[PDB]
């Protein structure tokens, strides 16, 4: 297949392309949601010891489909529990409170909440890649 081997088209497509994920604060997320009404995804993980978490981060959160979907439709908040901790005391207290608040036990776990703190849906690690993961969240949050 010469066509498959060929590439690097002169004509540029999709000017929008894709952008990296923009992390927001828990306090900031709600502020925006109160105004924008968009759901908040809290990412609970172990950056330095949970391999499955790395996989979720590397394969779904950092995936192009996830980036595009979330950049447009969601507010993302990072909540990490590393072995080597260097987060400010205030951040750690808030993070622990949040972990308990949403009854988070297993990681990786992504929980969707509204600006009033109501849970719309929750998901963990699920094979299939970024495209498939976003389809699932859409159905869960009733986005259409």
Which domains are assigned to the chain?
A: 21-144 (3.40.30.10)
Consult the annotation and say whether 52 binds a ligand. Answer: yes
C-alpha span between 2 and 57 (Å, rounded): 35
Counts for the chain of helices (H) and strands (E), in that order? 6, 5
Strand order in the sheet with 119-123: 23-24, 75-80, 40-45, 109-113, 119-123
DSSP-assigned letters across all residues of 21-38? --EE-HHHHHHHHHHH--
Q: In sequence order, what E strands does the chain have? A: 23-24, 40-45, 75-80, 109-113, 119-123
- The two tokens of residue 51 are 């391999």
Burial 96-110 (b: 16+ CB within 10 A, else e): eebbeebebeebbbb
Consult the annotation and say whether 51 binds a ligand. Answer: yes
What are the beta bridge partners of residue 109? 44
Q: Is residue 56 packed enough to be buried (19+ CB in 10 Å), middle (13-18) or exposed (0-12)?
A: buried
Q: Give every CB contact of residue 135 below 8 A, 6+ residues apart in sequence.
A: none
DSSP 61: I
Terminal-to-terminal C-alpha distance of the chain: 39
């Amino acid at each position: 297949a010469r066509r498959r081997a060929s590439g690097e088209n002169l004509q540029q497509t999709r000017p929008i392309a894709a952008a990296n994920l923009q992390w927001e604060s828990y306090a900031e997320a709600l502020e925006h949601s109160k105004q924008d009404h968009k759901p908040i995804g809290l990412f609970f993980t172990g950056s330095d010891w949970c391999m499955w978490c790395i996989k979720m981060q590397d394969q779904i959160l950092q995936s192009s489909e996830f980036k595009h979907f979330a950049g447009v439709h969601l507010h993302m908040v990072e909540v990490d529990f590393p072995q080597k901790n260097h987060q400010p005391e205030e951040q750690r207290q808030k993070n622990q409170e949040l972990k308990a608040q949403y009854k988070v036990t297993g990681f990786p776990e992504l929980v969707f909440i509204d600006a009033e703190g109501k849970q719309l849906a929750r998901m963990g690690f699920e094979p299939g890649g970024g495209a498939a993961y976003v389809s699932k969240v859409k159905s869960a949050l009733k986005l259409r």
